[PDB]
Amino acid sequence: LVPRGSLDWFKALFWKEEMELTLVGLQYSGKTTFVNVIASGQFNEDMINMRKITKGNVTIKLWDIGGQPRFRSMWERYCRGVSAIVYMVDAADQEKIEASKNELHNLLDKPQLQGIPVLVLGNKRDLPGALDEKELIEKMNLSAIQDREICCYSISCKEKDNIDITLQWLIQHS
């Protein structure tokens, strides 16, 4: 009996969805850690920087943003058709926020990606002084993003905090 409403409950629901997503953000933001949590440490991975993660009916295109200039266009074009963009931010690394913001805004400035919902995740909320979702909406200038649905949650992969509401949001955007 999988406690209804538990994290395992949402994980099960999530993986059965036929869904493509991109998971992208600066290196060290917690993207690999996040996949490991939501996939319960079991998933398929194929290199394609870019990783194609598969589990259930779900495919995740995982990549670190701000990589080689020659591959940037290729990675952003590889995101065409996804149901959602999940943008991971290290909410406790104040000095990387400006780079994180600028890469997000440059990404959402790409044509093939028009209208795709974005979920910004302020990861590492467990660390003292980490930005909360209100502060991140502010520091990331999320209000400037007007041609799409954008949402922002404060989460902890380490303490498995708000991972459930993240899965629910993703399921809603199948």
Enumerate the known binding-site residues for GTP: 27-33, 64-68, 123-126
| CB closer to ligand GDP, 115 vs 129 | 129
Least distance CB 114 / ligand GDP (angstroms): 25
| CB closer to ligand GDP, 48 vs 144 | 48
Positions touching ligand GDP (CB under 6 A) are 25, 27-33, 64, 88, 123-124, 126-127, 156-158
Give residues with Cβ within 8 angstroms of 3, minimum separation 6: 9
Least distance CB 45 / ligand GDP (angstroms): 12
| CB closer to ligand GDP, 14 vs 87 | 87
Query: Collapsing DSSP states into helix, strand and coil, what is residue 73?
Result: helix
Least distance CB 12 / ligand GDP (angstroms): 22
Compute the chain's Rg from CA coordinates: 15
Residue type at 55 in one-letter notation = K
Burial class (CB within 10 angstroms; exposed 0-12, middle 13-18, buried 19+) of 100: buried
| CB closer to ligand GDP, 76 vs 90 | 90
Least distance CB 25 / ligand GDP (angstroms): 6
Angle separating helix axes 163-172 and 31-38, nearest 10 degrees: 80
User: Whole-angstrom Cα distance, residue 155 to residue 116?
Assistant: 22
Question: Kindly report the CA angle at 44 between 38 and 47, in degrees rounded to 5?
Answer: 115
